[PDB]
Structure 1
Amino acid sequence: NQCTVQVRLELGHRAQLRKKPTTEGFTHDWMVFVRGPEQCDIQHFVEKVVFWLHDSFPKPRRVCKEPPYKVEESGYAGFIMPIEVHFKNKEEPRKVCFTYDLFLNLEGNPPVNHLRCEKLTFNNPTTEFRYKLLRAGGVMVM
């Protein structure tokens, strides 16, 4: 009737210098992901994650319909990556779009290993979607 459910997402990325021929253009390997915290299963409320890569990549609309929600790639530059997390929700909101700063380690700096923790607050979710948030390890507030 009246209640808020909070769930947690973790977006992150790893990047390092690629050990390859001088004549291979891509300097870096990187990996971007969405996950839950330890012993939460976001798959209960996440229908899919869509990573929107730079237009220069082949098939830059990358869909993960189940875990792991991640893209592994090679490249030569950082970019801003739209990341859409779609919900198993019959009403609004149906999804959330993050603007992810995919930056590389440049000038012989250590590997990048970044995490961005997002808190989602669902006000007054339906019965069915409430159960999914709770199954995923969501918590109620009051």
Structure 2
Amino acid sequence: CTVQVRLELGHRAQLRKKPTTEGFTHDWMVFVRGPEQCDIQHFVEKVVFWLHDSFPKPRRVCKEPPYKVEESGYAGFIMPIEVHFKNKEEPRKVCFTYDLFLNLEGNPPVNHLRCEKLTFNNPTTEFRYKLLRAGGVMVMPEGAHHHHHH
């Protein structure tokens, strides 16, 4: 038994004309979502966005869609992102590292997107049900039989 399912990671960034009072030059938004017409809430319990230490309360949790964070800042950084599953066995979660980069003056706003495919070996029937409700496919080996004589 094998279940394959997909996730989307992305972010948008925009250069401000006039910086904020804190000197922030960009407004940005980072998100986790499913492919077109796939509600990952079926199998995702929560998403934790680990912002840089310079933000207040940088451990940002989304327990329900939209799974996203909207902020303002002056510099890009690598953002660890944890997608937690509605699963009582391991794996309980999956960890990504996302490059939240900002655009230079003269380049268009950022609209970056990533597609990630998760593969689970023999998930519990309850969890595999949730994955198949969100665009997954289940694959099960069977006994093969040849079509010709020898």
Q: TM-score, normalised by structure 1?
A: 0.94
Name structure 2 gaps, 5 residues minimum. 141-150
Task: Return the alpha-carbon distance in structure 1 between the equivalents of residues 64 and 99 of structure 2.
Answer: 23
CA displacement at 1:131 relative to structure 2:
0.7
Larger radius of gyration: 2
Q: Which runs of 5+ in 1 are unaligned?
A: none
Identical columns (%): 100
**2:33 touches 2:66 (CA, 8 Å); kept in 1?**
yes
2:21 partner SS: coil
The size of the alignment, in residue pairs, is 140
- Structure 1 counterpart of 2:93, from 92, 95, 104: 95
Q: Deviation per CA, 1:90-118: give whole Å up to 9, x if none.
A: 11100011000000001321101000100
- TM-aligned CA deviation for residue 20 of structure 1: 3.0
RMSD: 1.3
State how far apart, in whole Å, the 2-side matches of 1:55 and 1:109 are.
27
Taking the aligned partners of 2:20 and 2:59, their CA distance within structure 1 comes to: 29
Q: 8 Å contact 2:15–2:105 — kept in the other structure?
A: no
Structure 1 runs of 4+ off > 4 angstroms?
21-24
Query: Structure 2 length normalisation: TM-score?
Result: 0.89
Q: CA deviation at 1:30?
A: 0.3
Q: CA deviation at 1:141?
A: 2.7
CA gap of 1:35–1:23, structure 2 versus 1, over 3 A, is closer
What is the alpha-carbon distance in structure 2 between the residues aligned to residue 10 and residue 22 of structure 1?
A: 30
Q: Is the alpha carbon distance of 1:78 and 1:118 closer, same or farther for their aligned partners in structure 2, counting shifts above 3 Å?
A: same
Pick from 73, 79, 82: which aligns with 2:80? 82
